[PDB]
Amino acid sequence: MINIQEDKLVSAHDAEEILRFFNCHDSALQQEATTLLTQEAHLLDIQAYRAWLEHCVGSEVQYQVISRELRAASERRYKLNEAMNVYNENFQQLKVRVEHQLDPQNWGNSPKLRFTRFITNVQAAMDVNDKELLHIRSNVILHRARRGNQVDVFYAAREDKWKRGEGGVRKLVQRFVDYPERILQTHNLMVFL
């Protein structure tokens, strides 16, 4: 649908993701993806991190949040690493982060933190080659509050792949976020987007 020679601001990656959703629209799949993401965001909001790992996250997951360096729109010569990885986790690494959240000596989790997540703009399309796999796109606003007057609000678009799994338990196999703010003003990015 997009011609990126004409639509000069659009990246090749973004144009490919638009092509995936404007073709085969299955309303039932969209509703199913909406339920899945609302349940995942409820487990995270109540800080049921073990339940999230067990019910929502696949053993082959890649959970990745990048931060891209700011470069000129006309850049074409400088070709060094374009982005670092804020997260680039396999299942074991997510498990380490969950154990860190749950440890009694994680002093920053006392008083208990308060999370509220707002998931919108859900789109879903099956993968063309692997029918175990569903592409789901959604945007999240995440509010994390603590210690009386600390309030941090995170904003991001999520490009996910979820696989059927067994027993109706669809599980995340890839989450990719290109975080929109280069310099974070939320103290850290220590939240699961």
């Binding site: 360096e69 700011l70 990885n85 690494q93 380490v96 974070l184 103290h187």
Partner: protein, 447 residues
Amino acid sequence: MNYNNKILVSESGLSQKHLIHGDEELFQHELKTIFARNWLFLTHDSLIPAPGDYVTAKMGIDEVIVSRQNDGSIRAFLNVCRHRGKTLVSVEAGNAKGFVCSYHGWGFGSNGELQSVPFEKDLYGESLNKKCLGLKEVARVESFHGFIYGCFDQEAPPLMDYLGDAAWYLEPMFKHSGGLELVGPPGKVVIKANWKAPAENFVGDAYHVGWTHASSLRSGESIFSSLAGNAALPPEGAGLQMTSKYGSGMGVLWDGYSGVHSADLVPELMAFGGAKQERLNKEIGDVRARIYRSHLNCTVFPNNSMLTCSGVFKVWNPIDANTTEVWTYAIVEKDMPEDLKRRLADSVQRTFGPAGFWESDDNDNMETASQNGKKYQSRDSDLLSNLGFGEDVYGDAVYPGVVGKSAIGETSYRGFYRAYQAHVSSSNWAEFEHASSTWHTELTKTT
């Protein structure tokens, strides 16, 4: 406040007034006496290798453009147009032969020169003296094994002399390993802490590791673990602390080459570091080859810190007395297999980057200690740094600098704050030297 006379740091660096982490007049005074006078980290050769490559960097609150010249040298200029003061470069890195201002179109070369002015003949005729309108240049730019530092003060000691006794400890990893590379882009996050809170923690604080990082060590699956929750005090002879005349210092934890990296990297790293140490024994001696594969927690005065072996590299960029912008890069040895470089870089960000689970343990400590420096009843209170005082030596036959032969102490805090005091109460480098002519004697009292 009269900075010639006010005792902000007590004799021998034993204590500091808590107001130093909260007073905004002192922060403005540090812009002149700390940031415009001392050497500040800019970039690494690996991030601007080719002619025309540039990056932007902060030096205190100022922003500079750091550019690789055609002759192979590096020059750095204020990122401010010489006409009406607009910010010239709005990106973080690139490759260019010059920078054009978006306001009136003046074009500056990579060498800072004013090269072109739109319609110069019709408008200025021959009146514009472009030779006097180059970008404001950072007077001093020098390298320590590929790590590039800048200083606005032409009078500063050379960078190697400024590192003083700390240079000997950095050389095994920075020089004898074959060289390090800096992996970019950095993570960038704002914290509500004074710049000195993270600088003091990295220069000399091993005491907090077992308690502050109890959850990260226990969850983490790293080699310094058993310390989780202060369940064990490290072995006698497990490390040392050092400090130097111009303020840089570090802690040395013997043989902890895998550092904070979880168990997934432990074996491969312990295997790479021990193989290079065997080769280095013949070249630089057993003690120095052991230092290569020993974990150093260091601050290069004022605000650049690192964890060697773990590969964490930080810049604590000051914004105001309770705001700092934290830049986090990874450092890797150039001769490590590519795949191991990539994994180590992610591991650095996993543990100490924007979503670093170890770095998040320190947030409340750094922020609240800094913010309490503004509270009325705490401004004139004394922050203590006396652990180990009276057991430090100088001029040892094996380890140089003012050295505390114990893994946990506050030796390096005392050296950092002695240098800070001598800068804040001095008007120039000559006065700092006069205020520091008995620096090591002051730090070793009681010993």
